[PDB]
Subunit: 412 residues, 4 copies
Amino acid sequence: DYKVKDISLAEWGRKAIELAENEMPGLMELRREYGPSQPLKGAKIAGCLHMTVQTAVLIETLKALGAELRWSSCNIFSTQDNAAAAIAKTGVPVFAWKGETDEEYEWCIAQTVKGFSGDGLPNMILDDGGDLTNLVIDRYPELVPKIFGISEETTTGVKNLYKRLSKGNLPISAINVNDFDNLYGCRESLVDGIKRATDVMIAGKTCCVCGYGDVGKGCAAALRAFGARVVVTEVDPINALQASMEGYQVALVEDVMADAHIFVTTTGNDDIITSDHFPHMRDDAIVCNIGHFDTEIQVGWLEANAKEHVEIKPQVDRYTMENGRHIILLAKGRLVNLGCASGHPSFVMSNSFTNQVLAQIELWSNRDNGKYPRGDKAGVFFLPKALDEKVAALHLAHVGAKLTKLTPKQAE
Amino acid sequence: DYKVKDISLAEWGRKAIELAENEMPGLMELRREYGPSQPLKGAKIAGCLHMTVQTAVLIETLKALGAELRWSSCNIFSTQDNAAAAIAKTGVPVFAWKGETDEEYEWCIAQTVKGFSGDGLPNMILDDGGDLTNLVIDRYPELVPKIFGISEETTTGVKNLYKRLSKGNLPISAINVNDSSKFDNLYGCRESLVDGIKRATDVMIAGKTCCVCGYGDVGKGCAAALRAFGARVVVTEVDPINALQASMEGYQVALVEDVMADAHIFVTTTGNDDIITSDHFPHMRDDAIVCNIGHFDTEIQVGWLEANAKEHVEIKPQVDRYTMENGRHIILLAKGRLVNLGCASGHPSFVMSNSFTNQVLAQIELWSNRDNGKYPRGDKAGVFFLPKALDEKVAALHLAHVGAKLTKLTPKQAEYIN
Amino acid sequence: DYKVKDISLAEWGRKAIELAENEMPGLMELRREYGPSQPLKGAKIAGCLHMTVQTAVLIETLKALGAELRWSSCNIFSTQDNAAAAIAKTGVPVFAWKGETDEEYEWCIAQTVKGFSGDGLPNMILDDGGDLTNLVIDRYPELVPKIFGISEETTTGVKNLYKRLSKGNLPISAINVNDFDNLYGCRESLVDGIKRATDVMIAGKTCCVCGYGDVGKGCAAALRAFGARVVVTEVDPINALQASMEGYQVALVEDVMADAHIFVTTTGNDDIITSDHFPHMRDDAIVCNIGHFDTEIQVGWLEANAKEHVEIKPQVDRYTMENGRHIILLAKGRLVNLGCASGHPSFVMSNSFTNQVLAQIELWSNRDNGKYPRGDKAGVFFLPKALDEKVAALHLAHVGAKLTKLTPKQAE
Amino acid sequence: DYKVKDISLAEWGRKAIELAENEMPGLMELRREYGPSQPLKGAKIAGCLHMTVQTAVLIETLKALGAELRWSSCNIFSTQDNAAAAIAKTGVPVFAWKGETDEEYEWCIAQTVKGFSGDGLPNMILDDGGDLTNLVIDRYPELVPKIFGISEETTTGVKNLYKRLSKGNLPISAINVNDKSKFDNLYGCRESLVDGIKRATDVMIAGKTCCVCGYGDVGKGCAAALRAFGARVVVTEVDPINALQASMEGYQVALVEDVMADAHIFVTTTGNDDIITSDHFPHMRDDAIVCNIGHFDTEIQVGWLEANAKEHVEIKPQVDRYTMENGRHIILLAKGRLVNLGCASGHPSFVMSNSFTNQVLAQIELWSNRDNGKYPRGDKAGVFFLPKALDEKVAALHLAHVGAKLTKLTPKQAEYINCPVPFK
Ligand SMILES: NC(=O)c1ccc[n+]([C@@H]2O[C@H](COP(=O)([O-])OP(=O)(O)OC[C@H]3O[C@@H](n4cnc5c(N)ncnc54)[C@H](O)[C@@H]3O)[C@@H](O)[C@H]2O)c1
Ligand SMILES: NC(=O)c1ccc[n+]([C@@H]2O[C@H](COP(=O)([O-])OP(=O)(O)OC[C@H]3O[C@@H](n4cnc5c(N)ncnc54)[C@H](O)[C@@H]3O)[C@@H](O)[C@H]2O)c1
Ligand SMILES: NC(=O)c1ccc[n+]([C@@H]2O[C@H](COP(=O)([O-])OP(=O)(O)OC[C@H]3O[C@@H](n4cnc5c(N)ncnc54)[C@H](O)[C@@H]3O)[C@@H](O)[C@H]2O)c1
Ligand SMILES: NC(=O)c1ccc[n+]([C@@H]2O[C@H](COP(=O)([O-])OP(=O)(O)OC[C@H]3O[C@@H](n4cnc5c(N)ncnc54)[C@H](O)[C@@H]3O)[C@@H](O)[C@H]2O)c1
Ligand SMILES: Nc1ncnc2c1ncn2[C@@H]1O[C@H](CO)[C@@H](O)[C@H]1O
Ligand SMILES: Nc1ncnc2c1ncn2[C@@H]1O[C@H](CO)[C@@H](O)[C@H]1O
Ligand SMILES: Nc1ncnc2c1ncn2[C@@H]1O[C@H](CO)[C@@H](O)[C@H]1O
Ligand SMILES: Nc1ncnc2c1ncn2[C@@H]1O[C@H](CO)[C@@H](O)[C@H]1O
């Protein structure tokens, strides 16, 4: 009752998972604190989130708290096969491998919304990006009354929730967990992706980072840390001013398309790098995306219009254009940190995932309350604000950070 | 109808103000856009904010939109005398000079609460730190019902608004301009902290160990500034979120006791009392530098220090050297008053343009909604943020200066971003 | 007449090499400029230097100029098997694979000092770290008078040359090529190696960087950029003062050994991380070396005293001590950038490799006029200072750097 | 026997000097170690070096070691009047004030070249820029045979010596102290560049575009300073090596004319003339700030700016605003003279301690070897560096102040580096 690339990678995955646990004290602490009470006993969680070593620790936290889970990846190139095998070996139903086709992707999510114990139906959703949420609401309406809550990981997913809400298409309440982890995360995993794919030198290069939210900020800091000159693009005046204040030129993509060695899309929006840009790119320009959906880059156009295509090695594709110059595309435009490397490290993921677990507890344990209503009163909510202090404190010992104590006088 | 140190500094103040104007396109654009409609005609603003070159651009912006003003500074050591004189010369009543006594300070704020046209009473408050807000509510109860609104500049001022509200002591509605700090507080301090320390002491930053107390936007800027020059910064915090942030930024997070013997420089940024104490001074290395950049000097136990030192020498104004029983020295900046304004010129005018543009839009907002119950007087009185569309407006006004070019969304892109 | 791991990796290695050529304008310009004149015709170069994609470009540059070459790697873990294969395929004798044993390592170097055309002997040495130099001098006395020069890449190798000279044991003249590129290289490749090995988060960590020469400076800057707190150790007061001026605490290994998450040795010296340190290290502390020799870390002691060992994957080993805690060792203490990632990237390797080619021309072409004496008068020399300018100039267009012209009046 | 602005600034001067002392352990330790033996007893030193608080500590170190000194500043706008006053009040002949005229500047130097005990003549030169060196050689040839050595502080002065030498015009031997430069220049400018700009103008660095011309140690420090505060720096260079370094550090390398219309701030650091010219001023954006941190003001064509501006306003001393014919303004700092010293206090004490400690060791070295020909007078004269091992000695003196703990090599480790228990 699983489908993965190679069950024999399980032993390697288990060792890697053991290393991540030691980097994920938030998750390990929730097991110690909540294990005895089993606050997720009864929960049947359909999960759609990149099947990584980090996610494996999230799954075993939810399981240790009593949940039953069925799992798939939310991207065709993000699964870490050793992690998926490590989880599959333990008997958790998981349907994930690195390098899925579109139809295999859709097949995998569908395996997670049936096959549980009892009537075989999920009662909880854990998503990021919003593919499992959209699949259930739009293609399993009979499931909709069965689901007590959604927890959502990422900006793109959160925007999908409000999109649905505004026009009466959200029948299940959600907890927004996405709302600087993604700044610090991309600060280390963007260049990891790029280097594993190309080994290219960052120092001395001109780079074009499109967008300057938390993800752009982190990407821009990462490249600049290594001696790249970063040019930023933005549609928002607030973020553009912040980029200038941080020492970056803010320009149009067209202003730099002929000089940039590297292009990185962070917008969460479509058609950022287009047919109007590719013909003008310098020889062997590197093109990649770190936004949730690959459509930030017109990959379709690029493949259809190149005179020649060579695969350097998986997720590194080199295209020869009519003009004779080359373009290097990473992970076919899919999120480059997970596509070409390992995504965000454990320590930062511990923050986000500790909230994921808390969001699942909060929705499950209030399923009959009208606190998170189903149907027409359904909304999008935040975790109670005291939990942000809870999560943060759980990570201080690991870094040796020692907190000062207010005196009675100071508190008041 | 004013009191400043020296009216002859007016011409120099005027030239500095003209340079500031060129660095404050937000304020200069408000004059262009709103001059015609005189939206503040009838407003009588009592202002209590550091009387600097930057504040003069603010005053003359409010004046150009039709307001009547009386002004004081919100700190005894923050006034720039040339800017105060330039304003006095124009006929705006201003009561401010660098180096006021506590009594002169209180006198100055009292001058802003009378002497207008008509009944002579203010109808609006623009405040920084809350001294004038407290003065009106606590000492002028007859005046309270004539004040249509407060705009507050700073974090501690905002903290004071909520504390008041929670005790049933806030009868006037306020707009929170500090949180409308992402900019003012971080970018501002990142440049003005070391400027203050340098003008005061000429000390090298590289090689030093610095203790930065607190890690909000103010502490983040300060720490970034000392770090950039090659200092090793140790951060202290009571809040786990902020402490994790500091550690993610490469800083050791520790107690003041952990570094008190090693730190060349101590900077308090908490907005709280008793950060650097009697428990700390006796253990500091020779010529350790102590300063504060939070709103009130009581972050440092200045009183205890002055009382317990064996000798005191004034190196130059706002730079004081204390010899302890140790035989060792401590250098104190601006008697613990905000060091950037006390020893240098505070935040540069570019970033002040952001906070002051907001300040003006807030006075406009509160003033024009006079008869609305949108900003209730009496029992329903609250703290409000500026309407959110204005944050984009303000940012946009500062982009041309920096040569920042915005991308235009296509119709399809615009549809699917809203 | 070669020995590599897998010849079928050649096609992949060739694509990698083609991408590197584009990032190495120095070497490609030498081919264009010196191709016609064949300045190395007759030279028979025994080469001992990390068999990487970058080195493959160097090998082909030397061959394009007329050299005959036989190659080995100067480290058991640094070879990139795709690069070794692509070179082997062309018919250049190379004896290198990732994961050599010591006997295999020695055998590989033996293969490069015999088997050329004519009498089968080399007449030129290209070295990285001194091993090939030491082999010829100490174990091949008959060969010594046949070698017309040595060029040496690295600090450790340069110190070995001056040591030999001072004892009268240098019978062959050398060009010191080592003498910032190591700073820029390590700043990008130290973290690349740590991350490919462990996927650990850098932000929030305490790191102990031993040594503050160009390598240490780059390592510290890398770790600091990702938000680590770096403590530096030094024996030289000049380097120690620089580290303080750059914002780093300078302390002893024993001052931080209990708290450091990562240890990085950069000294070029032995016994930096010892039996006096391992037992006090926190759980899952990461220990790695980026200096030329592994003996900076007491790996033999660690392995002999660990109560448990687990290979997480090749070149990542976790040791359980008697105290119950774990130590993570990267590449068995061998240079971590090369052993766990790909080493310095192409662009920066182009600087020193352009100089290697030039040193080799210089030595070879002046082999008879006594400019570089053999025997008693042998010395260590530098390239003429005007070549430093020429090499740098070849790399400016790639980064879009526009040089200002002095006016005639400014020149004087 | 002195000429300063205002002897009543002596009290302030002295307090500041005492604080500087605490920041200058190199000089303070040399006082302690060489005091008893009086190595400079007999030395008569003509000094020409910015008359700052830092220099005062240097002066008093030299006197504490037995020297007679006569001092002038090496720049018109760099004297700190409180420091000069404190020095004069001790009875050391000093001729220096902030804001000297050219004529007064030369007069000041002339006063240092006579008036000692005995025949009233100097036998040593401590220089910064080469002005005093050039006066003695070109204008006092009867004095050349009397001078036992020159110690030179700065890059420009060192260029001046090599230039002289190559034309047979160096008859006194010099110690190159500048090559110090790894420290003084980079770390010093990194803090003092922006200090000068801000004291002058209070301008925000964040968000600005800056043109930094040259990328030697000074340009590197100036670029790092501006970038730290969030400015975007464009670097200009004539040397491919430096240009590649700037590029590997994340800076665009371009021509002045590529960024002259966009730049808010211009900083010249080349040590060369005619960097910012009549070709640039007319295209500058409104209130562009132009300054120089290189030794001579002629990097910027100030003569031209002043003669061609339609309006001039002195904002305050050393801050001058010019209205061009196009109606736009240009803000010039310290009339193009070194901005860190001209508009602020120069490099801070701690870093000057390294440079000045070398200065003292250079004077001891030249003086104590005067009758043995190690440093030849006459046609055999040349430029030398300090003994190699003094570098480590100087650096080690400054480690305690910053709390840096040195690792001690074991005997086995010293064998391997092949060094004593000098290192590099
Ligand atoms: N790969 C990862 O590990 C990772 C991590 C977090 C988030 N994400 C995804 O990355 C994306 C960005 O996340 P975020 O939190 O920064 O979102 P964000 O919305 O805060 O940032 C996007 C920014 O892009 C700007 N933008 C939109 N269209 C643009 C265009 N036409 N040109 C230039 N700028 C444009 C917007 O103004 C906005 O400031 C989202 O899709 C999110 O789901 C990925
Ligand atoms: N000088 C200026 O130009 C300037 C500019 C902006 C704000 N301010 C003032 O600076 C102060 C701080 O502003 P902010 O926006 O950063 O406020 P903030 O509330 O966001 O930051 C203060 C931080 O200090 C911490 N803290 C509180 N007590 C502490 C203690 N005893 N020890 C260690 N940490 C402690 C809190 O956790 C908090 O993170 C306020 O007084 C504000 O008005 C001054
Ligand atoms: N892995 C790579 O890609 C790479 C690149 C260049 C150089 N290297 C090698 O790295 C090593 C360092 O190179 P470098 O150029 O920085 O040389 P370096 O000699 O300039 O730096 C070594 C530093 O370590 C210090 N040191 C020596 N022993 C010490 C000890 N016991 N404790 C603390 N500090 C000590 C020295 O004082 C010196 O400052 C050499 O072995 C060199 O060949 C490796
Ligand atoms: N103000 C101070 O405290 C201070 C401190 C140290 C040195 N200095 C002075 O600063 C100047 C520079 O010192 P440095 O040590 O950096 O010298 P340097 O010679 O090492 O650097 C100057 C750089 O400028 C470049 N350059 C020359 N002409 C150029 C031009 N036309 N356009 C662009 N680049 C050009 C050169 O290639 C060189 O790299 C000297 O005059 C020195 O004496 C001042
Ligand atoms: N290593 C990882 N494992 C699982 N999810 C990750 C990892 N790195 C990033 N992500 C998540 O992917 C989401 C975008 O799809 C981001 O919000 C981010 O949290
Ligand atoms: N130059 C300045 N002029 C006026 N107000 C300033 C200046 N610099 C800082 N401030 C304000 O002082 C407040 C703290 O009292 C901060 O909110 C900050 O905005
Ligand atoms: N990718 C690489 N290919 C070949 N040599 C490298 C590479 N990266 C680093 N090196 C060299 O290894 C030497 C240390 O033995 C360093 O001086 C460095 O130049
Ligand atoms: N505070 C200072 N006192 C004296 N000289 C200084 C000071 N700051 C910089 N300088 C020197 O000015 C010389 C250039 O004229 C530089 O070599 C620099 O060392």
